[PDB]
Write a protein that binds this ligand. Structure first.
Ligand code: AGS
Ligand code: AGS
Ligand code: ADP
Ligand code: MG
Ligand code: MG
Lengths: 340, 254, 258, 327, 159, 338, 258
DNA sequence: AGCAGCAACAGAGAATCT
């Protein structure tokens, strides 16, 4: 029963092993969980719309809230979870969602009311609402407007612009903030201590620095570093270099070579060095980000050069965000910034 | 709580057959003097109203009224397990999320039990029945069904006209026109075939054939049908049960 | 000569609109001609077919040429049309109103008084789509055959790598002139390796005996790799003559091994 | 009980006297209903302006407490096709009421999602059955309705809620709830609403939940800004000043510390800087052209994701290069 | 074809004579202006104004039946300076509750049907009005996108 | 041949020793293993390394696999036909074998495999770049809901089209192309095992210099030129280039020689003939641009404009579906530039 | 050769009704001790297996076994000519390309004869029946049909659970849940209505309702149905014939497996 | 690369007649 769950969690990757089960495990998204804890004692949970960067804990927060609300018994009877792996057209929204909303709430047991608040409403959550078409979204308007007495709607998305304006107005907007080093160092250190991850001083803070506001990727990188340090068995501590090696970060010397080729060099030398660099597998997004950090941070370039480098890096990132060829985009970016 | 046992599951199945198709949601309410149920179609031209007194049941217990709404389609889907001769017991607590239908054969043998999910419907029972109607008539329901089935083919509207000692059903459409004229008469050879008519005022109303077709289903519950018409309100077609009745109120076409 | 009743109740064949989009009348205001053409494109409702017509016609049209930039400006519109057409399947068709503007850019850019003759047109795209479908189906069948035999090869073979790298080399190996090899032992060893390759790809040698009274039923490979690899019509004829002698030798070796 | 509904649903107006903001249309509709001549209505407006509440209160005032039976209310949640029209709407219009005597009301809420064939079939239902029933079409976009259907109804445009009406509703809510609100906090709340009562009610409930107290204290600007995650005008103007005057590295550091100290979003800062720079009396419009173009491009890129630092540097560089033409 | 001003004016005068309504010349002019050759819409607006205020005056007609939507959009697009067009878009359209989709779509119609400017500049303005539409259909519909569209249209008109 | 000499375990790998050690570290504890995404250049050997890692997570029976068929119904009764590579320890799906119906196959098949279930069954998604955004969104939650029964090993050549949620939901492993020296050492063992005659060893190095890190292309070209030299490679054996590369080179020669609409027609014809023979348009554009930059007749001003137009039209092609509509536009823009 | 004459064409028609719909191809084999037939559905979760002994026929002659495969649909299309009371003779040579169905009325009058085209199917009869099953039960087949028809409406999965002296069928889906509980009992007033149960081990298996629905058709061949369940193999539902039986083996759902 | 609206065909159930 519970022991099987404990063992399955212990044999699970750290992303799912340390998933927040209660509203207190949320480390940084405090403004939302404060309201969620206050409404736990009341019974006026409004329709909610979670939006923010990926890996901020929206799904974990709503799961912990539904748990703390309904208990592990009513967790499976008063919840309608619809993900992006299911059909969510107009037909589905009109039939299934509306039939579940029109239905009455299931009767709680005697053990439920003694430990959990058991609100008189159920919860219908729609994860990854970006893939929902606007007509199927507008179909949900009156469905969530008239049956609010018996069901509550929780939308979850990454881009709040993909959801129509009426739905965004009907739901309370909860913006999840990026999890940088400051507001996630406590959670990362807790995960490291619970797994006996022996690292150096500036490793964890560096990991989140590579994560760029993503605790899931940071936990995955920490698990990979711990596995790589346990395989060696040397008993030493994990270093920031070993972490940034497996995180896809280009070494500093290879980036300085690119800066030298951009500063001094013609089209042919730059093209040859780019062709050689693309042989070693590096993500073009990470290279663009590192070049942006170096160029904007270095206090040795003119402001007129800085405006142009910022606009060129922005254009290159916007083009790379569409599935383009990394080699062509990187070469074009380096050539354009070399003419400056 | 709800605790109503029908001697034969068949009675309940025929009653629900009456709500079937023409309405989607039904609101039931059990109480000390029996069970009532109301359902209104989407266009709001038809109201189906049921009343089953305590005596229609083999066992009925109610110390606390319960109101429950449900999807009829879901109900009928489940309403073909009665074997007709099976015993049927409707069961529900005072604050139900479901309605339990329990079919059992005489012997302990086979027990089919269902737990139907309920819908929340704002309780708002209508009381549109009139004290007096312009005209009142009853006739065999199979005869009424034939009359409706005849005329239906000709038009989407069937007119009912009443004058002293004369009842006339008329349809007129594309292929032509038709009419069925019946006269009041007492048959002593068996009065269940008689045709009674009490007219206080001549009436002439038109109804949508699609609705009259839904209404004729009540023939399966009673030998006779009562029709009450008025120029001031929806018409009433009524099918009596032993301790109870199934009523259809239909708004005339403007 | 019957056309009066057509002028009375029928619209403008999309072909007639395409030929009108490349014509400028010197005696009418360019704005009036533009609004007349806009109304004709909108009334037809088939902006896509008109544009495909414009795309097939523009290379053959006479247009005062400076550096063939006009074509560069029109590639950006055509790309705008393709994005708009993709979005029509994703979004409610409000964007359909802008579809009539793209054909009118051809009238602005390529409309000339020189274009007095009607250029007839065809549908290369439907033929190319059916050919691309047939070639994709052949490739999908080869990829399934590799998955059933080669347990590991299937993990390293993408559809693109199979078409551009593997199949052209495989065909060059089968089409190689074995008549130049004087060493019988080396010829036998190469033929045994080629029989192993034909077996790994599940390539069957079929004797097509569909020859009317002419005493050489040509041997064909099933699936026909030739239709996917051989883009050049000159190379097709050279390769067919060489393959016929190789395939008979390979069939004899497959029968010997059987 | 009504204490379980959210504040957006709990405070839904039930009478026409509780619908604030709309006065020219509310009085005209009241006169239409009192004098008897109620034509086919077309309530066009943005979300959260009070069209559905207005028509519900109107039907309540017309038919009484039995509104839910004498009115045919169809919306996008229900199947609205051409056959649905042909059967349901025509049978409702042709027949009469089963509860009383009087004209009927068909409320086609959110009718901007109806099919073109459905509207083409309904435009002759509205014109044929016009002595015993009426039609009310609610819309947010007037381009999704055919011109034939658009010409048969009297159009009423629901303007966004002004300051006076939204403050009146806020005062009503603060009377109904044991809650106090600061004046500057109220002004900041009105600023982040754009005339949307739903947002105001939602964030008011959320900041009441944020109070953490038995509500013996007040709600200040800090509570609102920390609960809605919206940037403050102080940090907004500080970032704008550091971008316009200070150095590139210093501007980058200022933007980073501002967006990381309160967890602010780059899109909110972009919109705030756009709103602030709209009042700037500038030179030749080339700077405004460049600024608007680059800011809209960066916003459209943010709407799809990417690197937040790269986009922030892009915003800084765009504003700087746009203002470099003003000299 | 469309009904000229004289015919709709004559029909409205006949209706007023048959109904004994108090009216004025400027009120009837505003009614016909907001009708746009639509006799049914003209009679509907007249009846609505009568039942809402009693006197058919231009002030009442304008306060009950907002001015034609396409005309303000045309005046916004035909503006000579960027600040004037921005102020028009802000006050007349955005501050009155007009959705961005209606603004951009009405904008497209106005341009397509424009005749003051040449064909090439009209096509460029239609092209710019299109990107703003694509961005608004993707859910990025805000005031900044319309402002950028107007800026690009003015840059095209800026030779 | 490439297939006759291929490593089957982690100890049989012969390049990227740090990557082999990282794979051994990741396979030391196989049950607490997150999802993996192998990215890098095409032809590096990531599909062999994933199977070698599976050979360490499970028994040697992972290579004994079979091809089955599964049918699916979209809205139409159309029975999307998809073949599946299955093994008693893992299964491989390639959603690049169909059109916009990747989401259906992904969701249904993965839900069936996850509901039926060392203790988990591995899933290898081949060519994850062809996965549409809707299919990736559908897989986003399937990756997290079933993490104790289904582990994904997605093989791709560039994480550019992969969405950020999927990137975060799995570990990222880069596979850098092997150095020319390692390629030469591998070709040496191959030619000593296949009994090839080398007059001078340096030719092998040149093969690497003609493959650009690609081992799959290197071995295939070595074997193709070994059949032309009759199993005896000399000091000046010609380099065997694929037919499409020669067509692209001739196209660039035509481009730099003549810049007109009459030549644009034959350029469109060549593009049609290339696209009709199962050649992707992105690779065509990449090779065309890279070989146009190699033209010594042009200057830096021409090459910069060429690379800018190629990036623009690559974005266009990634946003469009009619590939020739963008290829012809890029060719016309290059003609206008020169 | 094949030479089997059924007294009443009706028996064969009901037997084929059992294979009907749930399978497409059937492999028959006649031999010295009778006729057997096997058919497996595409998903391979259901096997339909028939056995008709020599005594079930009015005339049967076999000096040389014949195996023949055919399309079930084609066969049923032809299987409505039996008048039920007609005599039916199945006929085929030792190397058939067809199967002849010969229906004749008592008198020489009407002779309907069919020549059905055969399909080539790799002979591979399965022998998956177990020695012992966890539990065995029989009950009237009309009762089993009702039980299946009830529950089917509620879910695509129907669970069968067996404990000492208790058999319980359960379905649980969207609209709610249902269950039918039956108890073993001997009715001497007529034992064809009794419900027997022999349990060696409690069982609890889930089956796809669509398949159980296909299986209930056997009611038309026998008054009772035997159900044998095991946690180690497909369940067996059996309908006895006079000298023979029709068996349906159904694989339990793993969690999602029909 | 939805939906919808459709319309047509096939299958199942119910009623009537022999
Ligand atoms: N605030 C947080 N506190 C603790 N752990 C967190 C937090 N946010 C994310 N995590 C970890 O990251 C895992 C993923 O959480 P999710 O809620 O799925 O992230 P996400 O916001 O849903 O990203 P998506 O699904 O791509 S939008 C959790 O199981 C935790 O292990
Ligand atoms: N004028 C108003 N006065 C008071 N409360 C209002 C007003 N407008 C909106 N509200 C509040 O906002 C809630 C939603 O109003 P609705 O009428 O549903 O919005 P809407 O105008 O119909 O826009 P939609 O539904 O998105 S098209 C109401 O229940 C009120 O609580
Ligand atoms: N460790 C290795 N040592 C030697 N050759 C290898 C090794 N791994 C892969 N190869 C070979 O190098 C080539 C790599 O191409 P391919 O296998 O298609 O790459 P991928 O595995 O990424 O699909 C193939 O010939 C492959 O068999
Ligand atoms: Mg999530
Ligand atoms: Mg509304």
């Amino acid at each position: 029963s519970k022991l099987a769950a404990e063992q399955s969690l212990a044999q699970q990757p750290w992303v799912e092993k340390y998933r927040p089960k209660n509203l207190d495990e949320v480390t940084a998204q405090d403004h939302a969980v404060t309201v969620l804890k206050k409404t736990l004692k009341s019974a006026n949970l409004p329709h909610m719309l979670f939006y923010g960067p990926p890996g901020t804990g929206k799904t974990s927060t709503i799961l912990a809230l539904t748990k703390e609300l309904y208990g592990p018994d009513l967790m499976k009877s008063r919840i309608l979870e619809l993900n992006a792996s299911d059909e969510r057209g107009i037909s589905i929204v009109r039939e299934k969602v509306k039939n579940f909303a029109r239905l009455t709430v299931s009767k709680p047991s005697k053990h439920d009311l003694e430990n959990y608040p058991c609100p008189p409403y159920k919860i219908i959550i729609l994860d990854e609402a970006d893939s929902m078409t606007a007509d199927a979204q507008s179909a949900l308007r009156r469905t969530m407007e008239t049956y609010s007495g018996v069901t509550r709607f929780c939308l979850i998305c990454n881009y709040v612009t993909r959801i129509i304006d009426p739905l965004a107005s009907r739901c309370s907007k909860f913006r999840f903030k990026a999890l940088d080093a400051s507001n996630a160092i406590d959670r990362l250190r807790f995960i490291s201590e619970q797994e006996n991850v022996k690292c150096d001083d500036g490793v964890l803070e560096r990991i989140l620095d590579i994560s760029a506001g993503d605790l899931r990727r940071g936990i995955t990188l920490l698990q990979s570093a711990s596995k790589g340090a346990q395989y060696l068995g040397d008993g030493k501590n994990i270093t920031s270099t070993q972490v940034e090696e497996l995180a896809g970060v280009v070494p500093h010397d290879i980036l300085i070579e690119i800066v030298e080729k951009v500063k001094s060099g013609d089209f042919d030398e730059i093209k040859k060095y780019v062709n050689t660099f693309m042989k070693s597998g590096w993500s073009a997004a990470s290279v663009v980000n590192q070049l942006h950090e170096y160029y904007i941070t270095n206090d040795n370039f003119d402001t007129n050069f800085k405006n142009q480098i910022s606009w060129l890096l922005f254009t290159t990132d916007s083009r790379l965000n569409n599935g383009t060829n990394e080699h062509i985009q990187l070469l074009n970016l380096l050539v354009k910034i070399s003419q400056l | 709580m709800l605790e109503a046992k029908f001697e034969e599951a068949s009675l309940f199945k025929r009653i629900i057959d009456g709500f079937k198709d023409c309405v989607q949601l039904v609101n039931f309410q059990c109480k000390e003097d029996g069970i009532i149920a109301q359902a209104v179609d989407d266009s709001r031209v038809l109201l189906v109203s049921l009343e089953i007194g305590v005596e229609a049941f083999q066992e009925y217990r109610c110390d606390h009224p319960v109101t429950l709404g449900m999807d009829l389609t879901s109900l009928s889907k489940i309403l073909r397990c009665g074997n007709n001769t099976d015993t049927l017991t409707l069961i529900a607590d005072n604050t139900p999320d479901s309605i339990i239908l329990l079919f059992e054969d005489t012997k302990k043998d086979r027990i089919a039990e269902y737990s139907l999910k309920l819908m929340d419907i704002d309780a708002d029972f209508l009381k549109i029945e009139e004290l007096q109607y312009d005209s009142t008539l009853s006739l065999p329901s199979s005869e009424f069904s034939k009359i409706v089935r005849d005329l239906s083919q000709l038009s989407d509207s069937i007119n009912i006209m009443i004058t002293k000692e004369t009842i006339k059903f008329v349809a007129d459409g594309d292929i032509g026109s038709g009419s069925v004229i019946i006269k009041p008469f007492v048959d002593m050879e068996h009065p269940e075939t008689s045709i009674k008519l009490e007219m206080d005022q001549p009436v002439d109303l038109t109804f949508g054939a699609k609705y009259l077709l839904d209404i004729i289903k009540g023939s399966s519950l009673s030998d006779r049908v009562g029709i009450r018409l008025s120029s001031e309100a929806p018409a009433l077609f009524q099918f009596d049960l032993k301790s109870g009745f199934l009523q259809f109120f239909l708004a005339p076409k403007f | 000569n019957t056309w009066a009743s057509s002028n009375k109740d029928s619209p403008i064949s999309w072909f007639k609109i395409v030929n009108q989009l490349f014509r400028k009348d010197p005696h009418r205001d360019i704005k009036e001609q533009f609004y007349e053409l806009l109304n004709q494109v909108e009334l037809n409702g088939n902006s896509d077919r008109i544009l495909q017509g414009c795309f097939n016609i523009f290379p053959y049209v006479k247009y005062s040429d400076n550096g063939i930039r006009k074509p560069a400006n029109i590639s950006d519109w055509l790309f705008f049309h393709d994005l708009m057409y993709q979005s029509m399947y994703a979004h409610n068709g409000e964007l359909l109103r802008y579809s009539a503007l793209v054909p009118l850019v051809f009238f602005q850019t390529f409309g000339d008084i020189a274009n007095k003759d009607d250029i007839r047109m065809k549908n290369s795209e439907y033929e190319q789509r059916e050919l691309k479908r047939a070639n994709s189906d052949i490739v999908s069948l080869i990829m399934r055959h590799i998955s059933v035999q080669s347990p590991l090869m299937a993990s390293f073979t993408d559809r693109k790598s199979l078409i551009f790298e593997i199949l052209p080399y495989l065909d060059s190996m089968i089409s190689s002139d074995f008549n130049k090899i004087r060493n019988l032992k080396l010829k036998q060893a190469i033929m045994e390796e080629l029989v192993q390759l034909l077996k790994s790809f599940q390539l069957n040698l079929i004797q097509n005996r569909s020859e009317g009274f002419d005493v050489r039923g040509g041997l064909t490979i099933d699936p026909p790799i030739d239709e996917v690899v051989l883009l050049n019509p000159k190379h097709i004829n050279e390769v067919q003559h060489k393959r016929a002698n190789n395939l008979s030798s390979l069939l004899a070796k497959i029968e010997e091994n059987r | 009980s009504k204490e379980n509904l959210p504040w957006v649903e709990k405070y839904r107006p039930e009478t026409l006297d509780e619908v604030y903001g709309q006065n020219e249309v509310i009085t005209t509709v009241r006169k239409f209903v009192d004098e008897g001549k109620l034509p086919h209505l077309l309530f066009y407006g943005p979300p959260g302006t009070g069209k559905t509440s207005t028509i519900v209160a109107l039907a309540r005032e017309i038919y009484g407490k039995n509104y839910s039976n004498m009115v045919l209310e169809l919306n996008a949640s229900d199947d609205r096709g051409i056959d649905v029209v042909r059967n349901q709407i025509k049978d409702f219009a042709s027949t009469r009421q089963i509860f009383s005597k009087g004209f009927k009301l068909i409320i086609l809420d959110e009718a901007d999602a109806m099919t073109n064939a459905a509207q083409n079939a309904l435009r002759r239902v509205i014109e044929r059955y016009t002595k015993n029933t009426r039609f009310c079409v609610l819309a947010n976009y007037a381009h999704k309705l055919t011109p034939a259907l658009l010409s048969r109804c009297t159009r009423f445009r629901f303007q966004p809620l002004p300051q006076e009406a939204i403050e009146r509703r806020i005062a009503n809510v603060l009377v109904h709830e044991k809650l106090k609100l600061s004046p500057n906090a109220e002004k900041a709340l009105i600023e982040l609403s754009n005339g949307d009562m739903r947002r105001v009610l939602n964030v008011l409930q959320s900041c009441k939940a944020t109070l953490d107290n038995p509500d013996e204290d007040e709600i200040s600007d800090d509570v609102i800004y920390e609960c809605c995650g919206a940037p403050r005008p102080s940090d907004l103007k500080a970032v704008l000043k550091s971008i316009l005057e200070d150095d590139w590295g210093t501007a980058h550091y200022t933007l980073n510390k501002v967006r990381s100290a309160k967890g602010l979003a780059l899109i909110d800062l972009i919109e705030g800087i756009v709103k602030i720079l709209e009042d700037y009396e500038l030179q030749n419009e080339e700077t405004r052209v460049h600024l608007l173009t680059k800011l809209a491009d960066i916003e459209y890129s943010i709407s799809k994701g990417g690197n937040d630092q790269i986009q922030g540097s892009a915003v800084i560089g765009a504003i700087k290069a746009s203002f470099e033409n003003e000299t | 074809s469309k009904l000229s001003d004289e015919d709709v004016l004559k029909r409205l005068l006949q209706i007023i004579k048959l109904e004994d309504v108090k009216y004025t010349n400027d009120g009837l002019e505003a009614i016909i202006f907001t009708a746009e050759g639509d006799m049914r819409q003209a009679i509907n607006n007249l009846q609505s104004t009568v039942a809402g205020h009693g006197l058919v005056n231009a002030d009442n007609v304008f306060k009950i039946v907002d001015s034609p939507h396409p005309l303000i959009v045309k005046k916004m697009l035909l503006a000579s300076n960027l600040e004037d067009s921005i102020q028009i878009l802000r006050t007349d359209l955005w501050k009155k509750g007009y959705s961005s989709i209606d603004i951009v779509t009405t904008s497209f119609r106005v341009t397509k049907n424009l005749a003051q400017v040449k064909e090439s500049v009209r096509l460029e303005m239609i092209k710019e009005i299109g990107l703003t539409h694509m961005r608004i259909l993707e859910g990025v519909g805000t005031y900044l996108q319309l402002a950028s569209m107007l800026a690009k249209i003015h840059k095209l008109n800026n030779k | 041949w490439v297939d006759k000499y291929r490593p089957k375990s982690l100890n049989a790998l012969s390049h990227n020793e740090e990557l082999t050690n990282f794979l051994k570290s990741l396979s030391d504890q196989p049950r607490d293993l997150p999802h993996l995404l192998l990215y890098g250049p095409n032809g590096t050997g990531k599909k062999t390394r994933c199977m070698a890692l599976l050979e360490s997570i499970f028994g040697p029976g992972v290579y004994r696999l079979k091809i089955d068929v599964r049918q699916f119904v979209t809205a139409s009764n159309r029975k999307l036909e998809l073949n599946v590579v299955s093994s008693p320890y893992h299964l491989e799906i390639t959603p690049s074998d169909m059109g916009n119906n990747d989401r259906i196959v992904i969701q249904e098949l993965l839900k069936e495999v996850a509901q039926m279930e060392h203790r988990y069954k591995c899933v290898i998604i081949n060519e994850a770049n062809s996965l549409t955004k809707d299919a990736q969104a559908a897989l986003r939650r399937t990756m997290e809901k079933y993490s104790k029964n289904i582990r994904l090993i997605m093989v791709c050549d560039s994480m550019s089209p992969i969405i950020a949620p999927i990137k975060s939901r799995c570990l990222l492993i880069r596979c850098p192309a092997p150095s020319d020296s390692e390629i030469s050492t591998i070709l040496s063992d191959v030619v000593t095992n296949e009994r090839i005659q080398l007059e001078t060893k340096d030719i092998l190095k040149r093969i690497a210099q003609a493959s650009n890190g690609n081992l799959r292309v290197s071995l295939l070209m070595l074997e193709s030129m070994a059949l032309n030299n009759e199993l005896a490679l000399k000091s000046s054996s010609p380099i065997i280039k694929p037919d499409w590369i020669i067509v692209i080179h001739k196209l660039t020669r035509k481009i730099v020689k003549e810049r007109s609409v009459n030549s644009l027609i034959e350029c469109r014809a060549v593009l049609y003939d290339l696209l009709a023979h199962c050649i992707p348009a992105n690779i065509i554009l990449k090779e065309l641009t890279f070989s146009l930059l190699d033209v010594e007749t042009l200057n830096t001003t021409n090459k910069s404009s060429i690379i800018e137009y190629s990036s623009v039209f690559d974005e266009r092609l990634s946003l469009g579906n009619k590939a020739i509509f963008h290829l012809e536009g890029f060719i016309a823009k290059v003609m206008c530039c020169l």
